[PDB]
Structure formats: structure tokens, C-alpha cells
Design an enzyme around this catalytic site. Structure first.
Site, PDB file in Angstrom:
ATOM      1  N   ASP A  83      64.863  44.286  40.494  1.00  0.00           N
ATOM      2  CA  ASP A  83      64.940  45.460  39.630  1.00  0.00           C
ATOM      3  C   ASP A  83      66.165  46.346  39.962  1.00  0.00           C
ATOM      4  OD1 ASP A  83      63.828  47.691  37.889  1.00  0.00           O
ATOM      5  OD2 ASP A  83      63.111  48.582  39.749  1.00  0.00           O
TER       6      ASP A  83
ATOM      7  N   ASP B 146      64.627  44.132  31.466  1.00  0.00           N
ATOM      8  CA  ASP B 146      65.702  43.161  31.691  1.00  0.00           C
ATOM      9  C   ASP B 146      65.398  42.085  32.720  1.00  0.00           C
ATOM     10  OD1 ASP B 146      68.323  41.895  31.788  1.00  0.00           O
ATOM     11  OD2 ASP B 146      68.751  43.133  33.559  1.00  0.00           O
TER      12      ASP B 146
ATOM     13  N   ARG C 176      69.950  36.076  36.643  1.00  0.00           N
ATOM     14  CA  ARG C 176      70.682  36.919  37.591  1.00  0.00           C
ATOM     15  C   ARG C 176      69.733  37.856  38.326  1.00  0.00           C
ATOM     16  NH1 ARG C 176      71.915  38.918  32.654  1.00  0.00           N
ATOM     17  NH2 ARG C 176      71.360  40.953  33.549  1.00  0.00           N
ATOM     18  N   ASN C 177      68.872  38.529  37.574  1.00  0.00           N
ATOM     19  CA  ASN C 177      67.916  39.475  38.142  1.00  0.00           C
ATOM     20  C   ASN C 177      66.801  38.834  38.948  1.00  0.00           C
ATOM     21  OD1 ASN C 177      69.467  40.901  36.231  1.00  0.00           O
ATOM     22  ND2 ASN C 177      67.849  42.455  36.039  1.00  0.00           N
TER      23      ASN C 177
END
Lengths: 27, 280
Positions: free
Chosen positions: B154, B136, B140-141
Site C-alpha cells: 500500500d 490500486d 508492482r504493488n
């Protein structure tokens, strides 16, 4: 030199790429 | 294992203060880590995700997720293990690049934009270069060091592949950010990330616009088969675009490899105003 000519900056939900098979799946 | 690499925390060397944010896979906070004794006080953001030996990963994830010496991946500072997993990392202020390009659409220049891309790419490369699988990757991450420096984060969704692994077999990871084999075939590959990365770029390009917005998270496949891909980013010359739509190819080992995305971007970068068209 190479931009999208959208009708009022209206950027569509999707851009189709068919019939290209690199993006269209065997199904 | 052992008493080195991956510091574990006694649930008393950090206090949960205010709630920075709650995600699908957990409610992260922002407290303070007091290395027991060590009169040195530290401000960070706690990651109390919520979900068996499915921790072998979490653990093996962090195990390398800390073995970082790259300027583009939020080294996992430490970890918390109670009856509910938690993670610590050197907190950033600005935040997730999405909030950023959302507070500065009419302020970011091609420069950075093309950059981040390359940086983000650099990072996805080092993890690929360490038998990892992000799963993912998204605006945002990703955390903001400086508008001139960004890092990836993470929530342990990754997983380290074991010598004979090429694909990972399976929270939930927003459907819209994953490849087609990830949806249809619960499969996670170094290449699926690429596809995730194409979405990322899209976002940033569209200044964090919601991918597909309007079309349910159900049909993304239904159309992903029909050869439908995100619209073109107005500020994007039909030359930047192509590297994106390219990562969204159906054949998975036909897409742009990471090392590569850097090349074609570490190039474009060399002339930002030429591939993007932003007034300001």
C-alpha cells in the site's frame, strides 16, 4: 487443449467482446 | 488513537540511504530504522509519498493497514509524519512481482503462477473482510516473500469504509488498472478491485506484459465501453481466461466476488499444468 492461435505469438492489443452487453455499455 | 497500534516514528529512528524507487505518488527509498535506543538495528524501505485532512485516510488506512494477521499483506510496520508523510514496512528483497516474472518468464511454472493468483486473491479477501478498499492493486504493488509466498503493498491509496459505505468517492492510479466506474465515475468499490485483479492476473499470465501497450491511456474508456478487453494470454487455456474477462463485466455486482476467485483458482491450482501451457 484451449489456447490462442495467434499468428506468430503476436498477442493483439485487444480482444473484442461485442455485441455482448455484459462488456458493451449503454452509450 | 492512543499509545498502541500504529507506531509513529520520531524522524531519527531511520535513515534514508539509496533510492529504491520513485513512483507517481512518491519516491520510496530503503534505509535503516534504529528503534531509538533499542540497540536493535532494522533495514526497511521508506515510503515518502507526496500530495489536507486527506490524511484522515492515510491514518485510518494504516490504522487497519497495520491490524494485519494475514500472510499476504505487507503489514504496515510503522509511520513517519513530518511536513510530508512516509511509511515503513518489513522490506523484501526480490521485489515487485512484475520485476520477478520479468526476470523469470522462461522459468516460472504454472504452479506458482496459478498460486500467486490464489494468494493475491486470499489477500484481497481479507481487506474486503475489513471494510477496506485497495483502489490500486497491481503486479508492482505486490511484494515477493518467496516464490512460494507473496504479499500485497500500500501507498495508502486505500480507505476504510464507514459502516454505511458501499463505494468510495474520489496521485492518480494508472488508468489501465481500474474498472469503468473508476474512470468514468470516480467510484471505488470492493468490485472495482476485482477488475484491477483481472489485470494483475493478465500481467503475470503474460509475464508482466504492458496491458494495452501502444494504445494511449485516454482511449481505455473509449474502448472499455466498446466492450474491448485485454487480449488472451498465450499460456492461458480459454478456461483460465474466462474468470478474468468475467471480472471486467460492465455490471459491477455481477463480477466474481473475492472469496470465489480463490475457489475457482484454489481448484485450477490443483492442476496447474492443465490450465496453463508453459515450456519449462
Amino acid at each position: 487443449k484451449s489456447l490462442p492461435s495467434y499468428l506468430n505469438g503476436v498477442m493483439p492489443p485487444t480482444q473484442s467482446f461485442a455485441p455482448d452487453p455484459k462488456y458493451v455499455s449503454s452509450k | 488513537p492512543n499509545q498502541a497500534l500504529l507506531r509513529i516514528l520520531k524522524e531519527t529512528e531511520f535513515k534514508k540511504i539509496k533510492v529504491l524507487g520513485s513512483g507517481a505518488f512518491g519516491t520510496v527509498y530503503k534505509g535503516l530504522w534504529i528503534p531509538e535506543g533499542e540497540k536493535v538495528k532494522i533495514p526497511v524501505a521508506i515510503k515518502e509519498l507526496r500530495e489536507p485532512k486527506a490524511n484522515k485516510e492515510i491514518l485510518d488506512e494504516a490504522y487497519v493497514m497495520a491490524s494485519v494477521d494475514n500472510p499476504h499483506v505487507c503489514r504496515l510496520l510503522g509511520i513517519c509524519l513530518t511536513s510530508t508523510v512516509q511509511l515503513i514496512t518489513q522490506l523484501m528483497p526480490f521485489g515487485c512481482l512484475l520485476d520477478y516474472v520479468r526476470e523469470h518468464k522462461d522459468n516460472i511454472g504454472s504452479q506458482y503462477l496459478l498460486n500467486w493468483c490464489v494468494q493475491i486473491a486470499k489477500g484481497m479477501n481479507y481487506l474486503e473482510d475489513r471494510r477496506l478498499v485497495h483502489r490500486d492493486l497491481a503486479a508492482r504493488n505486490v511484494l515477493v516473500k518467496t516464490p512460494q509466498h507473496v504479499k500485497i503493498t500500500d501507498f495508502g491509496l486505500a480507505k476504510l469504509l464507514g459502516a454505511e459505505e458501499k463505494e468510495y468517492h474520489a496521485g492518480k492510479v494508472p488508468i489501465k488498472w481500474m474498472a469503468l466506474e473508476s474512470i468514468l465515475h470516480r467510484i471505488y468499490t470492493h468490485q472495482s478491485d476485482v477488475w484491477s485483479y483481472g489485470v494483475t492476473v493478465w500481467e503475470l499470465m503474460t509475464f508482466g506484459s504492458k496491458p494495452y501497450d501502444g494504445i494511449p491511456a485516454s482511449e481505455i474508456s473509449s474502448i472499455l465501453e466498446k466492450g474491448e478487453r485485454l487480449p488472451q494470454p498465450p499460456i492461458c487455456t480459454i478456461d483460465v481466461y474466462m474468470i478474468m474477462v468475467k471480472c471486467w463485466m460492465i455490471d459491477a455486482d455481477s463480477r466474481p466476488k473475492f472469496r470465489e476467485l480463490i475457489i475457482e483458482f484454489s481448484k485450477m491450482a490443483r492442476d496447474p499444468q492443465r490450465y496453463l501451457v508453459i515450456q519449462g
